[PDB]
Amino acid sequence: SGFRKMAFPSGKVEGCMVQVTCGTTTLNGLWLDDVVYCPRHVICTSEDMLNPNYEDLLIRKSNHNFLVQAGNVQLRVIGHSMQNCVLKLKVDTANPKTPKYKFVRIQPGQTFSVLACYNGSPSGVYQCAMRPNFTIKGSFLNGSCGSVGFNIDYDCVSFCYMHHMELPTGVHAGTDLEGNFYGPFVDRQTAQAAGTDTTITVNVLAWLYAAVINGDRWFLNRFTTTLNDFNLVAMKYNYEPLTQDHVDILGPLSAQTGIAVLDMCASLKELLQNGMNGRTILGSALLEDEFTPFDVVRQCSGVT
Amino acid sequence: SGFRKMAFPSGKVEGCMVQVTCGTTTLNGLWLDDVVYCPRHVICTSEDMLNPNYEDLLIRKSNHNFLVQAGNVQLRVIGHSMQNCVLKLKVDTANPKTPKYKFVRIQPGQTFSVLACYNGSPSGVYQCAMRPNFTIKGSFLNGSCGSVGFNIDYDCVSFCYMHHMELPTGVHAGTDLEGNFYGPFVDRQTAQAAGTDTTITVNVLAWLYAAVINGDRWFLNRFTTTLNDFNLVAMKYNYEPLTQDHVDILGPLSAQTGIAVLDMCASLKELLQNGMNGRTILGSALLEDEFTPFDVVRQCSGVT
Ligand SMILES: Nc1ccc(S(=O)(=O)Nc2ccccn2)cc1
Ligand SMILES: Nc1ccc(S(=O)(=O)Nc2ccccn2)cc1
């Protein structure tokens, strides 16, 4: 019993973190096989970041200008290429600690673990969600760029995020491991405003199921609703519209608890209209939306 | 910028987890040098747990009755001893992945990371606090016993917790790595009620400083207070009394922000008396108490 915001064990990713320095800029890289992946803005001065031409800046860089350090050992750079917003540095040594891995581009509302790093050294691990506006709400100081987000399926690490930017509003933007930004963001120090940070409805419903499984039941009510009726309420409260795909995904949690998905929607509708009245659910005074239905099943079933 | 509930990177502890089986009971053990540490209730049937005589049960066990598996390799048990509520199994092989480590007994209000494990396999990592009633609020299913709590100082793991029990109220109890329970709890399936779960005042104050550093400032007010006046309010709201030792510990955060500790106490006093009025601080609708002053400094300074 109990339900916690839980990250994946980080060891498999710790084994992949290195320091990348280009001139006076240091950040983190990800070493998988004989390639190190890092943000292309490693090549920028803070002055360059205001208006960078990355192809033109990169022409002034050679393999020997990229200093890659794995613990206290230097790696030899034998090639470099830019793919979208990431640099790929080819090194002469395969990472001996390379785990089984994939690169995946996640959808908004999907959760992942971040291993925050500075100078190639892990400092902490926490759980994030890709927000519906394609920002994340992380914890990143200067030097954290190139820290990665990931999920683990048994022994296979799926890398989904690399940290690139902090927006003027103090939320975070980055890329998949192909170097494509999530959302409309660019690796330039310019005005970039975020869209509406809507609540991830299917994740709130998952977390209410987690609450029932763990004995927090006060919010269960005598009502039901329809997807259309629920969605009028979601729209009013800046919640993502609920689709039949989301209802299907919540099927296992419905079956386990015996609470029909549309009944839990009616409980959520009442919570939106009435508030928490100073009560808590799983130690929260607000409706938590950074657990996916898969997260709730995993944590409630003890998957390793 | 941003502030997250952050766990320590778990790799150094993942390298220490093993499976311990005695008869039909399987749980987790911690392998450090040539010793495996696990809960002594590994020797109990569920029937035994109602009223166990551990010395008498242990007489019926030999070294060969303790099956220790490290990944898919069996370790040879060459001795066993009971120390308080933990078994120490001496094996013939030192763990090659043994990190620098210490055993520490933490004080209530101190935070630590838990690596939740099943069958010796890590499933997740999250951040806990030793509550003032000597419970923790974890996420532990059947098979999680012997999962450990720890802090890391650079390269040295300080182990502070091993999981033993779930109370009938669904909160958690365990031991330090000398096998001494935190609080009054025992490794028996009997009525054990928890005392008041008071709020860890010094940690709330730390988190309000974290909020100011990260730009959440709406709760700062025009008032100050005294320790005695603040403490009358703390008592009313089931908060731990604030001591001059706590004021001293918050000194660096006071200095960084320029907000005198007693001024932040007066902001906290108003929040207790007035509530949040539907507002949030660092994405929370309640006052968070599972960050220590050291946690806030570490996360805000990027210590690796
Ligand atoms: N929000 C935002 C998005 C893209 C860019 S740009 O660096 O592509 N530069 C551009 C884009 C359009 C017009 C002029 N410069 C800058 C800001
Ligand atoms: N809450 C609590 C604490 C200790 C015990 S005991 O297993 O030590 N057994 C005892 C203790 C006192 C009287 C009888 N049995 C049981 C319950």
Swiss-Prot record, chains A, B:
Result after altering residue 132 to H: In strain: Omicron/BA.1, Omicron/BA.2, Omicron/BA.2.12.1, Omicron/BA.2.75, Omicron/BA.4, Omicron/BA.5, Omicron/BQ.1.1, Omicron/XBB.1.5, Omicron/EG.5.1
Activity regulation, per record: Inhibited by pyridone-containing alpha-ketoamides compounds 13a and 13b. In turn, alpha-ketoamide 13b (tert-butyl (1-((S)-1-(((S)-4-(benzylamino)-3,4-dioxo-1-((S)-2-oxopyrrolidin-3-yl)butan-2-yl)amino)-3-cyclopropyl-1-oxopropan-2-yl)-2-oxo-1,2-dihydropyridin-3-yl)carbamate) inhibits SARS-CoV-2 replication in human lung cells. Inhibited ex vivo by michael acceptor inhibitor N3. Inhibited ex vivo by compound 11a and 11b.
Reaction equations catalysed: TSAVLQ-|-SGFRK-NH2 and SGVTFQ-|-GKFKK the two peptides corresponding to the two self-cleavage sites of the SARS 3C-like proteinase are the two most reactive peptide substrates. The enzyme exhibits a strong preference for substrates containing Gln at P1 position and Leu at P2 position
Record-annotated active site: 41 (for 3cl-pro activity), 145 (nucleophile)
Name of the encoding gene: rep
Entry's localization field: Host cytoplasm; Host Golgi apparatus; Host nucleus
Peptidase C30 domain boundaries: 1-304
Full-protein residues shown: 3264 to 3567 of 7096
Name the record gives this protein: 3C-like proteinase nsp5
